[PDB]
Amino acid sequence: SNAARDNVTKSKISQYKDQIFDLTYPYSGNENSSVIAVGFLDYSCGHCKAIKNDIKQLINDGKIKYIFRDAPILGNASLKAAKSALAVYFLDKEKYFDFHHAALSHKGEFSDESILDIVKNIGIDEDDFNDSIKDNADKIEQMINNSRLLVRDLGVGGTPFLIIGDSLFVGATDLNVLRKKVDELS
């Protein structure tokens, strides 16, 4: 696009800053970094799957806080995988990225079983996992609804997209562009 439209994006990010940088959502990287990235993903989306290592590398660079917004819009399978991801988060936050990355690595469509195969491979017990789904159902539901509305409010109209600082990157953004913006802001 161009300057005028980027300026509007900056104003919207300020308007929704409490929502975008909400602290109750899962994050990796430096908790205390002022350079905060906020990623919006559907696990069944082809472009979301393909940037999984861009995300991993950008996080491992060490410079940012990266918040994960699970924004399922591609159907029942995505909602399941999204719900399951947060069900892991609330059991053990250190395992959320592992579910995240495995879900993105999961090439075919999700099924109840394949999601459990993932919960098993990352060290979580089926019964702890089932109790998490049920016990935290209201809060998971609330978090996903709030992310969907945020995606609507930002008007992007699909996934993936990534907010860093006052900028919004749409689609499979090259890693070098993200890194330059992060450095500029550091």
Residue numbers in the entry: 63 to 248
Paper text:
The introduction, isomerization and reduction of protein disulfide bonds in bacteria are controlled by disulfide-bond-forming (DSB) proteins. wMel strain encodes two DsbA-like proteins, α-DsbA1 and α-DsbA2, and the integral membrane protein α-DsbB. In contrast, α-DsbA2, which is highly conserved in Wolbachia, does not interact with α-DsbB and has a long N-terminal region compared with α-DsbA1. Our results show that FL α-DsbA2 is a strong protein disulfide isomerase and that the removal of the N-terminal residues eliminates this activity but gives rise to weak dithiol oxidase activity.
We used two constructs: (i) FL α-DsbA2, the full-length mature α-DsbA2 (lacking the signal peptide that directs the protein to the periplasm) comprising residues 16–252, and (ii) α-DsbA2ΔN, a truncated form of α-DsbA2 (lacking both the signal sequence and the 50-residue N-terminal region) comprising residues 65–252. We were unable to generate crystals of full-length mature α-DsbA2. The crystal structure of truncated α-DsbA2ΔN reveals a classic monomeric DsbA-like architecture. Using SAXS data, the molecular mass of truncated α-DsbA2ΔN was estimated to be ∼23 kDa from I(0) and the Porod volume, which is very close to the expected mass for an α-DsbA2ΔN monomer (21 kDa) and is consistent with the crystal structure that we report here. We next assessed the protein disulfide isomerase activity of FL α-DsbA2 and α-DsbA2ΔN by following the reactivation of scrambled RNase A in an in vitro assay. By comparison, truncated α-DsbA2ΔN recovered just 35 ± 3% of the RNase A activity relative to native refolded RNase A over this period, similar to that reported for the oxidase enzyme EcDsbA. Therefore, we conclude that α-DsbA2 is a protein disulfide isomerase and that its disulfide isomerase activity requires the presence of the N-terminal residues. Notably, there is a basic region near the catalytic site of both PmScsC and EcDsbC that is absent in α-DsbA2. A hydrophobic region is also present in PmScsC and EcDsbC, and the conservation of this feature suggests this is a binding site for unfolded protein substrates.
